[PDB]
Subunit: 217 residues, 5 copies
């Protein structure tokens, strides 16, 4: 009837009003600073090792990367907006961290829509699915001990004074690993590292993804 | 000329004169009907366990904000529009290995009751072991489709049939289809209280001899 | 004077047509449109018998005619036509029905508009499509076919036509790996069980063999 | 010097003013007409034959194409703009000619920034570097006389009544040709042609690039 | 605590607005610019002797300085630098002179601006370029070279320099198929027949062989 449709129009109007208040009526978040640093939580879900090229020492992974962070500027009171407690939004409408693989050999291919979820406490969750080619020698992959490769993920432009990274666990989520992959996973870890480079006095933070794998027999 | 003016006026009223639809919510949910028409298994790569399908995916949904009265617009009952002018659902394959390649123009049909129909043709690479494809029983592969970001409380999926449409399947494909089904599934994940919905596409196929 | 005036007249004409008139929203059942299609086949680049895909290079002449693009040349310094970005105008959504890869566009997206309202648009394309090349290494060669038509409009909104059923082969690459034995382009009226309206396509049929 | 700093500020202000006068304050050039035709000068500099594929009869060239033309609407008096005699601008800010290879088999890949130089007399110079795949039978490439291939370049949509082409020379510039290419160049010419096609009563102009090449020994 | 954070954000938003929304057409003969280049070579991924193309992965440090990007930190809560989209600022059109494919960009297009007006931009890239790998399976290895410079500006508008002639090899992939015997980056001044003005490039010269 009318009243059901009216409720739906009101819920839409509340959401449109909330997004307008947050985005159109506030300068966009200029990113973290030394005085206002930000912690980004990263977690990997490895779906498949698609290919290991021993002629070029490149390996191709398919995974999704959970990214979470929290901004005061994205907070609201649900009671002021019809009890809206979260919403979906284009990743282009918000600031997102510039988390980059440090040893890719090809631009990352994006396999999922660029949409994030924002919650009323200001927390953002963004889960890009990706295919990554990275530097990896697959020697030993046809052996019982398998091959080991590693790739670091972190901000390309922010030091540890502006962006800290963490993981919720050092165990990579392997529960959705493709059971009929050409490669089986012996272990996969994701470990926060504090790095010093000779160029720079400031510390840099990365998450090191280490995968040990071999040919499935 | 009046029919053109009426259509231009209708599109202007819907699009230019209404704040853009922010997507479905718990309070304003949406059902998307999905159906597959499989045209070709182009390639089955046993060196990487990837298979490439060509298909078109019929997507239908309905928005109150896209409704109009035909009598107010010269008895226009529907129109074609760029898919960029409207909200579209983020239906995603859960086990692709490459970005989907779009093979058809990004245009939808909107009807006066607010229903939208959008039929993207696609080439998809997905995770699939083709072992057995050179046998009578063939190989079986599966891939799930659903929203990447919305739970079942915002977007429900359904199919009109569990039979994949094979009436357009390429007769000289390298592979013949033994069966193809499309089935709604309700899943829970430990992170989350809400249900998640997918459609599971299951294809059994073998080398054409 | 004259060259400055011809420029000024053209700028004025384009402004009058584009900036000062609501844009054509496409055809409808009440206001249907004829689109003429013709193919010029330049090259069969590749025939892959491991996947049954063939790659063609061709250009597709598309013609249609709109009242809203008409003008009187006498009101615009005897300008009888002009070139314009295909993004400035409506263009038909003509699609191959059995491609296996996105079409690669090889020419600039520019159309010619004439004072009688006729539009001509000639996109050059590389297309991979479903094709079994069995027989290509024989005297009789192989035969493949691909249908082209609107993706979203029925025969009640867009009627598709050809000026001839002969594909233009006068630009076919003489040192191609493949020679063309015949190439035809034929209008077809199709009924599908989903739908009461007729659908129109042009069926491109190419018979070819190794040179 | 403070005067030196002031001059620099003024030169910047003058250039911004000039670009604003030309671009923001004038209807954009709608292209040539039968009454107001345009001559484009083309020259090719061939850098490399990268690949000659005899399984598909496609050859891949890397070259840059100098394009020059002149518009009355891009003229200014240097004395009105602090003696600015030219400027660099994004090729997206100006009209550029639709010069197209007639027998490419793949979209051209652009290897250089899309920036042109405009001079006060209204002349424009634009030098896109490109990788082109085109139709070419490389039979004979492993012989003393080598293989010969040809590709025509011209407007896709304008006849010779609206766009004329010319070359300053019929010799392709070979002074940048890669000395350790897989292929050596025996000759490379660029020749203006006036062509009649049965479709069309107006004549069409192209520049025919003819390259004779063989495997380097 | 929260107020300080809001103020630091407001100061940065204000600084970016002052610099960008409330004010560079590129260098000119009257207002020339020096760009410093340095290369960090990460991997020789592939050396194709059938086409004489080699593929490198590296990052290229670019540095330059503009008066129009200067500010006083004391007027903006002691902000001494900030990160910004490379689309918000002018960037130099530094181009490889002998690429055979469009460069693939491997890093986000974000730069760091410092209060003295200096900009640092470090694009990571995969480049295919013209290179004969003959001798790569020998002790002396192969040598290839590629020049980088502006595509549209002469030495009257853009000068280049390097901070060192040694390419940074400290990030070179230890299990690459190729080992680096040497890698240098050298400024060159060129005169061409077409043109009276000088042209500047940085010549990257790499000697490499199969890891054995
Ligand atoms: C994090 C980062 N981004 C920009 C360039 C590469 C890198 C990481 C590798 C070493 C140098 C580096 O530069 C500055 C600090 O660290
Ligand atoms: C749709 C989706 N979104 C982001 C994470 C991955 C995935 C898809 C694979 C299974 C878990 C999942 O999450 C919740 C629902 O389904
Ligand atoms: C033109 C078209 N539209 C979108 C779906 C696919 C197709 C073409 C293949 C057969 C069915 C079809 O649908 C209805 C009419 O024709
Ligand atoms: C330049 C051009 N434009 C569009 C189609 C192809 C071509 C070139 C090959 C012959 C015909 C042609 O058309 C008109 C005259 O020239
Ligand atoms: C820098 C540059 N720009 C565009 C064309 C190619 C090149 C570089 C190779 C020699 C000629 C050249 O032009 C002028 C001087 O330098």
């Amino acid at each position: 009837d009318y009243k059901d449709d009216d409720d739906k129009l009101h819920s839409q109007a509340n959401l449109m009003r909330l997004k307008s208040d947050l985005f159109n009526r506030s300068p966009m978040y200029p990113g973290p600073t030394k005085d206002d640093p930000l912690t980004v939580t990263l977690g990997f879900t490895l779906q498949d090792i698609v290919k290991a090229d021993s002629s070029t020492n490149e390996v191709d992974l398919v995974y999704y990367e959970q990214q979470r962070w929290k901004l005061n500027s994205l907070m609201w009171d649900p009671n002021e907006y019809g009890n809206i407690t979260d919403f979906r939004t284009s990743a282009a409408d918000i600031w997102t961290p510039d988390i980059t693989a440090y040893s890719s050999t090809r631009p990352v291919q994006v396999l999922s829509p660029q949409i994030a979820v924002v919650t009323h406490d200001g927390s953002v969750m963004f889960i890009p699915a990706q295919r990554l080619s990275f530097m990896c020698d697959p020697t030993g992959v046809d052996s019982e001990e398998g091959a080991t490769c590693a790739v670091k993920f972190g901000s390309w432009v922010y030091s540890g004074f502006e962006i800290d990274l963490k993981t919720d666990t050092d165990q990579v989520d392997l529960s959705s690993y493709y059971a009929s992959s050409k490669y089986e996973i012996l272990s996969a870890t994701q470990t926060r590292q504090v790095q010093h480079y000779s160029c720079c006095p400031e510390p840099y933070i990365d998450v090191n993804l280490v995968v040990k794998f071999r040919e499935r027999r």
